[PDB]
């Protein structure tokens, strides 16, 4: 009974949750178009999701590029190998630390702010009065928030990389006196356009669809009580950033193995 049925009870309830989240997105994207009422609304959500998150990625992009330059130099300088520091900074970022750490910092700021907003909008009766005015809430609220999230992440990755590469080029070339020509020339013929640059672009788009979907669904199907929204915000950061670290292992076994 209890070990047998209650695991059947509590696993079927997950099969409704996957079905409630799929039916939400099909009714949000696949719709009757409007290109001069959603396009002013896309500029607002491209500002809210992206632009306010641009300060946290610039400042935390320089830092993680620096500590791979500091701790990368001190362990390499005994063998007189500091002219291969750029092959460590600009390959940790372009392969793994770029698409992943810029995803966990996106699911934190933008992932919680979308779930705590549509959750509180549902509790302060602004989704019941909007749908009782012949205005679709899945086309007004969810639809310009999905497209502004699948756009803001692959652009925030290349700002995280290009200051991380420059951040390692500040303690390499300038602070610790590695040569200005041997540093960059050893980085250039180790980075290929197909294996290291496009395969970072493919990683960011898959993480953008994943993070934005879980962030809007947990803020739509949330209990509107006090702790209902506080444990839908926790449910966003954990579930959508385990699917980053779960999909990254699958993708890094396919694109680099």
């Amino acid at each position: 009974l209890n070990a047998l049925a209650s695991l059947g009870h509590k696993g079927i309830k997950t099969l409704r949750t996957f079905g409630r989240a799929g039916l939400m997105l099909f009714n949000a994207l696949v719709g009757k178009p409007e290109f001069r009422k959603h396009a002013p609304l896309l500029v607002r959500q491209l500002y809210n999701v992206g632009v306010l998150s641009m300060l946290i990625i610039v400042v935390s992009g320089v830092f993680i590029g620096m500590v791979l330059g500091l701790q990368g130099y001190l362990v390499l300088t005994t063998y007189s190998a500091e002219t291969s520091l750029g092959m460590l900074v600009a390959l940790s970022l372009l392969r793994e630390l770029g698409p992943v750490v810029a995803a966990l910092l996106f699911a934190g700021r933008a992932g919680s702010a979308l779930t705590a907003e549509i959750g509180l909008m549902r509790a302060t009766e602004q989704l019941s009065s909007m749908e009782m005015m012949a205005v679709d809430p899945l086309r007004r609220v969810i639809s310009p928030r999905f497209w502004a999230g699948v756009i803001s992440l692959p652009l925030l990755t290349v700002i995280f990389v290009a200051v991380g590469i420059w951040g390692g080029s500040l303690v390499g070339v300038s602070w610790k006196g590695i040569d200005s020509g041997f540093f960059w020339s050893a980085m250039q013929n180790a980075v290929d356009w197909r294996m290291d640059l496009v395969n970072c672009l493919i990683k960011s788009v898959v993480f953008a669809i994943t993070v934005t979907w879980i962030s809007l669904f947990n803020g739509y199907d949330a209990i509107p009580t006090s702790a209902g929204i506080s444990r839908a915000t926790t449910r966003t950061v954990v579930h959508s950033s385990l699917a980053v670290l779960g999909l990254d292992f699958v993708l890094t076994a396919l694109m680099f193995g």
Partner: protein
């Protein structure tokens, strides 16, 4: 079609409880129809079945000849341009002041010009009296003023059906002296079908053309005011006035008792 909203044989279930056994009501086209009953009986649930926000179990809800639960998602929001609704709690957009709040449902469905969308809603804030409060955000309105701002948003478009839901509460008797005249002079001047749900038995019975009183599972009585004044004897005239016993006046279907008091 001869009457706007028709309910064939509607049933409902909130998980375990059984409200709406076999109700069947009709709303004529262009006449104020009241809906009354005890507390917690499902009057707001009756208005939400018509809008399609919840679905019944056993009946058809015919809005102007077509069925509501047999309607797809893209057709439901085309039909819902015909019915507005006042909510019980105000429920207005908190990031948007009153003049941009009344002007919201007719900025979506009417292609009115800019000095005509400013002259229309500056009249809608004079009907309820809330002009000069066209710049306050809806966190510095009072709470009886936040219904008069949500009453202008229910009549901003002038749709074919308006479903009021306790409009007269929290108002002094010089303001609900003119809010009762606004609803009586809207269907008399524009032909708008109203549905008034309230607990002020002298107010809305003076203006409605076909009232409805609800009881435990289904309808108990219904006819024009006069014809519904004392003529149904046993269960009506206990609800309209009186304190003592009839069929289940109040006190939600409680369990035993002593077992409740003594441990």
């Amino acid at each position: 079609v001869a009457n706007l909203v028709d309910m064939r044989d509607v049933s409902f279930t909130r998980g375990n409880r059984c409200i709406f056994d076999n109700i069947s009501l009709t709303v004529p086209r262009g006449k104020i129809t009241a809906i009354m009953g005890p507390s917690g009986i499902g009057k707001t649930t009756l208005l939400r079945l018509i809008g399609g926000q919840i679905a019944p179990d056993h009946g058809e809800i015919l809005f102007d000849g077509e069925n509501i639960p047999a309607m797809s998602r893209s057709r439901l929001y085309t039909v819902r341009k015909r019915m507005s609704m006042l909510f019980q709690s105000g429920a207005l957009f908190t990031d948007m002041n009153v003049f941009d709040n009344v002007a919201y449902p007719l900025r979506e469905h009417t292609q009115l010009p800019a000095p005509l969308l400013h002259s229309t809603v500056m009249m809608k804030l004079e009907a309820v009296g809330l002009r000069g409060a066209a710049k306050l955000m809806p966190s510095e309105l009072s709470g009886g003023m936040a219904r008069r701002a949500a009453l202008a948003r229910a009549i901003a478009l002038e749709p074919d059906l308006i479903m009021f839901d306790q409009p007269f509460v929290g108002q002094d008797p010089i303001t609900m002296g003119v809010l009762v005249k606004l609803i009586s002079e809207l269907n008399s001047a524009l032909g708008v079908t109203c549905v008034v749900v309230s607990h002020d038995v002298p107010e809305v019975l003076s203006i409605a053309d076909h009232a409805w009183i609800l009881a435990d599972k289904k309808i108990v009585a219904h006819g024009s005011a006069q014809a519904l004044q004392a003529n149904p004897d046993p269960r009506v005239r206990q609800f309209l006035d009186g304190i003592a016993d009839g069929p289940v006046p109040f006190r939600y279907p409680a369990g035993d008792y002593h077992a409740d008091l003594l441990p």
